[PDB]
Design a binder for this molecule. Structure first.
Ligand SMILES: C[C@@](O)(CCOP(=O)(O)OP(=O)(O)O)CC(=O)O
Length: 325
């Protein structure tokens, strides 16, 4: 198509091992602390953008279907950022597929915005650095900043739009030895929940006082390829993030009894020499970090209690966002 510029990208979801939770800046999505994550091989979003001078506004088609006017308006504002960045006024048709178990509660924002950013950079030929790609994705969703990268990644909080972005952490191939089990188990949205907590939680300072120590400990753990050291700090970090919500005004939780059951089975696996550690995000699902060599053994412990359909593993991918057909 002569007057038409398109680009399609595939970006993979990532789970935070050290949590992003609370913004310093609501408009530009600058976080109150750094976060560390691992990018999952099995779950991803494919997003294609097609820019046409004769397009009157941006259109979003998701999983084969028109989105409502609310999502339409939201995506148009985001694309304004893109147009501003490219110095054009081209509108786009955006066709995205989420290969993420969203019905099952898995988040799609990270992969969604990371795929969109990359797709736009490819379509418009902006030649953005990974850094600028991460920055553009961050404007859409904080955790999207990390999905530009594979393996371990860290989002550096910074102090403004220029300085807040993620980068990949080389772990000497360690990500290749690791896996994650997902225990599948309206909700307050991540953005809304973290805002209430950051603004009002009586336990939020306590979170702030320990996160840098956690991050450093975890980073040193990764350098050492020390799984136990990594798991213990990340599990504690996770629980601390949920603690902060308990302190909110008024309190709330994302966890339910079943989540706690899942946690018990992880600790059971530890005492029985199957090392693994758990984490939870903005919902009751429990994610179990385990070494690949133990994925199966640990999975079968869970399959004693939970339906087979609700136990889902993914490996950690080494490569970052990719341009596709
Ligand atoms: C619990 C978390 O998963 C929170 C993620 O929240 P979002 O990345 O969805 O927040 P927004 O920036 O408002 O889009 C922890 C994490 O990924 O660091």
């Amino acid at each position: 198509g002569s007057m038409v510029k398109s680009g399609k990208a595939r970006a993979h979801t990532n789970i935070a091992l050290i949590k992003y939770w609370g913004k310093a800046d609501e408009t530009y999505i600058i976080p109150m602390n750094n976060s560390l994550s691992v990018t999952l091989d099995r779950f991803y979003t494919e997003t294609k953008v097609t820019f046409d001078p004769d397009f009157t506004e941006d259109c979003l088609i998701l999983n084969g279907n028109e989105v409502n006017a609310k999502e339409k308006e939201k995506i148009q504002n985001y694309m304004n950022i893109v147009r501003d960045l490219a110095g054009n006024r081209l509108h786009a048709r955006i066709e995205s597929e989420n290969y993420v178990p969203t019905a099952a509660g898995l988040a799609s924002s990270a992969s969604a915005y990371a795929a969109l950013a990359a797709a736009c950079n490819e379509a418009l030929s902006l030649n953005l650095s990974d850094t600028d790609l991460s920055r553009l994705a961050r404007r859409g969703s904080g955790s999207a900043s990390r999905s530009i990268f594979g393996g371990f990644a860290e989002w550096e909080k910074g102090h403004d739009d220029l300085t807040s972005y993620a980068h990949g952490i080389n772990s000497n191939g360690w990500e290749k030895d690791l896996s994650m089990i997902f225990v599948v188990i309206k909700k307050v949205s991540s953005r809304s929940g973290m805002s209430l907590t950051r603004d009002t939680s009586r336990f939020y300072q306590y979170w702030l006082d320990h996160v840098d120590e956690d991050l450093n400990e975890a980073k040193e753990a990764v350098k050492n390829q020390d799984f136990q050291r990594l798991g213990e700090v990340i599990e504690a970090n996770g629980l601390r993030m949920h603690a902060t919500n308990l302190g909110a005004q008024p309190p709330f939780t994302y966890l339910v009894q079943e989540s706690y059951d899942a946690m018990a089975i992880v600790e059971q696996c530890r005492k029985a020499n199957l090392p693994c550690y758990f984490t939870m995000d903005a919902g009751p699902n429990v994610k179990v970090l385990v070494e690949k060599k133990n994925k199966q053994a640990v999975m079968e412990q869970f399959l004693k209690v939970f339906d087979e359909s609700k136990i889902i593993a993914s490996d950690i991918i080494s490569s970052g966002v990719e341009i596709i057909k």
